[PDB]
Amino acid sequence: EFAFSNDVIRKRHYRIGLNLFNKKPEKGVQYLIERGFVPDTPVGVAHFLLQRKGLSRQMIGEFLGNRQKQFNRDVLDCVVDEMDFSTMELDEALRKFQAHIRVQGEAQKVERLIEAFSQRYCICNPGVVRQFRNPDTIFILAFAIILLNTDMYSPNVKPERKMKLEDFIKNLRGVDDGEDIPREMLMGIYERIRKRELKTNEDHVSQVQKVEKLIVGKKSLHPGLGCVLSLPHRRLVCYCRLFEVPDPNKPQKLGLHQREIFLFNDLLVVTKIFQKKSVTYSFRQSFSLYGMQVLLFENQYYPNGIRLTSSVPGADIKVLINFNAPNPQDRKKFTDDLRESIAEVQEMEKHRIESELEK
């Protein structure tokens, strides 16, 4: 009769719904609806996407930009109705819209997002609209602003090929049913974009991308990190300093084999400090959490031991790596986080097995 208590299991399933959204948005919102985390209405989902952390803004855009599905279309309508663009310049309004939603990728999805954005801008600014011979000029100009922002800031458009102010103006010549958009309107837009690239708000994917940069360094026909870290569903869980233990049955010097551990919701990454001045890391190994188990050990040589094993159904049992934590509190915190993430991944895969064994 009352709200569900947010215990460990309920919180876990909520995070699973977010994971599923960030992998397959339509399946994520179905999972979140059917468990009562979000109302079964376009407006309930719209406000969820705008308000709740843990959602990839890339994937929000892919969901909202779907022109074929009625539910997605109705959600996008409610999303823009929640925004007030009143008395803003069109590019200022668009900046506010794309701060919430990544407006990039497939051209059909970008067009769909800009269409809803533009219809809302027109509703909010009837006086601006009346200045034009055709209200669709607003939509064409909003699309041109997206194009301009990419042109101005995308390395794949060489500076000699980039649009200068007059290129931007002339490319829009005659679009208002044969008339020009007022020159000074285009000039203010161009200069505001030149002063400030349109940027989407950060999300958990942003933060994983910052970790990638700490591990790579400063690089090119081969940029980045071999290990693909920053997938849309992957989020940082915790960072931990531990000492690798090649052989728990023999002693080793204090401070040897120091590791900087990055635990994500579905991946454990082992690094070693590279340089410090502020810190950069060398990638060593990653481990999937599926089938992983976390053992504590204490013996005459290691008071705060951790052993990670791999026990995949149908496979044999394998030791992955051993650590010794600096202190018992650190071991408790890390192994508790790790066990929780393993439990989450296990439900994910469990959910995916039932999915396939019924489709």
Binding site: E106, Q108, N156, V157, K158
Partner: protein, 113 residues
């Protein structure tokens, strides 16, 4: 040649092999040492980079890529294209219709100014 060493030396007022970062722009339009500056002078258009990118996937240097192979790479690597995006790509890039993508033609199709 070292014509850029003479413009550098003109801004190296104490002959210690350095130019100021304030004049760092003024020098080009004509502390930072010379090894750094000789790099900024030496420091490719889109057409070529795209051709090279396609060539990575033309392992046998044939000049074409299989449509099924191009689809597999485009939808699975990097900024993953959708299947309808790849359909559009193949429509314009498979010139003959045999399922083999002439990427050299497609490159200019895209970068057609």
């Amino acid at each position: 040649i070292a014509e850029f060493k003479e413009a550098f030396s003109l801004f190296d007022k104490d002959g210690d092999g350095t130019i100021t970062t304030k004049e760092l722009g003024t020098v080009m339009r004509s502390t930072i040492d010379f090894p750094e500056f000789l790099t900024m002078m030496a420091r490719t258009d889109s057409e070529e980079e795209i051709r090279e990118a396609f060539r990575v996937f033309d392992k046998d240097g044939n000049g074409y890529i299989s449509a099924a192979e191009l689809r597999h790479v485009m939808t699975n690597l990097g900024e993953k294209l959708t299947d309808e995006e790849v359909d559009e790509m193949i429509r314009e890039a498979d010139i003959d219709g045999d399922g083999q993508v002439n990427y050299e033609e497609f490159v200019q199709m895209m970068t057609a100014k």
